[PDB]
Amino acid sequence: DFEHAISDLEAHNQAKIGVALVSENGNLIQGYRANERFAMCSTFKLPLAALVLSRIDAGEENPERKLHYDSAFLEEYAPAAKRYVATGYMTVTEAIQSALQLSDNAAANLLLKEVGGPPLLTKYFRSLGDKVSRLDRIEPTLNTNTPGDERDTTTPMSMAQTVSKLIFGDTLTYKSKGQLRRLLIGNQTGDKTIRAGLPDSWVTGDKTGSCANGGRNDVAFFITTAGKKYVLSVYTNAPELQGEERALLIASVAKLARQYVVH
Numbered sequence: 001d002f003e004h005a006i007s008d009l010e011a012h013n014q015a016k017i018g019v020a021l022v023s024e025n026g027n028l029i030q031g032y033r034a035n036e037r038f039a040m041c042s043t044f045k046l047p048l049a050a051l052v053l054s055r056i057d058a059g060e061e062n063p064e065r066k067l068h069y070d071s072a073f074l075e076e077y078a079p080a081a082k083r084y085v086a087t088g089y090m091t092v093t094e095a096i097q098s099a100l101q102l103s104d105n106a107a108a109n110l111l112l113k114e115v116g117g118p119p120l121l122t123k124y125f126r127s128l129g130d131k132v133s134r135l136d137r138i139e140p141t142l143n144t145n146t147p148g149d150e151r152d153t154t155t156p157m158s159m160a161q162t163v164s165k166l167i168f169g170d171t172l173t174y175k176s177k178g179q180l181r182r183l184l185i186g187n188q189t190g191d192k193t194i195r196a197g198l199p200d201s202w203v204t205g206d207k208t209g210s211c212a213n214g215g216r217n218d219v220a221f222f223i224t225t226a227g228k229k230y231v232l233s234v235y236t237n238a239p240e241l242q243g244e245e246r247a248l249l250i251a252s253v254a255k256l257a258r259q260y261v262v263h
């Protein structure tokens with residue numbers, strides 16, 4: 001069964017794996033360590049983007065507003081922000097796009113400053129009925145993934161439920177929900193993670209992330225050919241795998257979870 005299959009992957013890879021497959025309405029279909037805490041790493045950028053879109057929905061932000069920065073704001077991984085820095089800004093829209101599809105860390109920090117910092121993302125999670133997910137630091141130190149530390153964590157089930165609300169539920173405006181979904185489908189960083197374990201015929205959007213101590217995660221929504229809608233969260237710590245094997249591990253978990261998608 002699912003429990004034994006995932007436990008076998010853990011032992012074989014000397015990894016810790018947390019996974020939740022949920023339906024459109026947030027109900028757990030299959031899970032393993034689904035309520036244990038893992039570091040978000042870059043997966044937090046999905047609900048962050050949703051918070052910024054929600055602020056645009058509410059008239060508190062403009063998609064074309066210029067978020068100003070200089071070279072000192074750059075991060076080691078910030079491919080878009082490095083290109084825009086001579087102009088002195090990225091727009092809210094550019095920062096959302098870049099944070100989601102490239103995982104740009106300076107763009108993410110621009111958004112975190114825009115929303116009022118990590119505590120305001122925690123507040124947003126709480127507002128959605130997510131009692132667990134929390135952001136505490138900005139890039140890059142939110143990635144430390146230290147044992148016993150609850151900063152910057154989620155659980156597979158809480159994140160999957162939160163994502164299902166944003167992607168399939170009524171929380172965002174029709175416009176913002178579409179923008180978020182299409183951005184995630186166009187993610188550039190997830191071709192070898194959850195997507196690689198699902199049929200190519202299915203619509204998939206996702207947000208990846210990696211952390212210290214071998215953390216590598218992905219959260220995806222997908223829609224089957226039959227039109228059945230799901231969210232799959234996969235959180236892993238696999239310190240003895242190399243990066244490509246960590247992606248393959250995620251794909252392997254997705255393949256196992258895929259057998260519980262009914263036609």
Ligand SMILES: [Cl-]
Pocket residue numbers: 076077078079082
């Ligand atoms: Cl870069």
Ligand SMILES: [Cl-]
Pocket residue numbers: 210215216242243244246
């Ligand atoms: Cl990695």
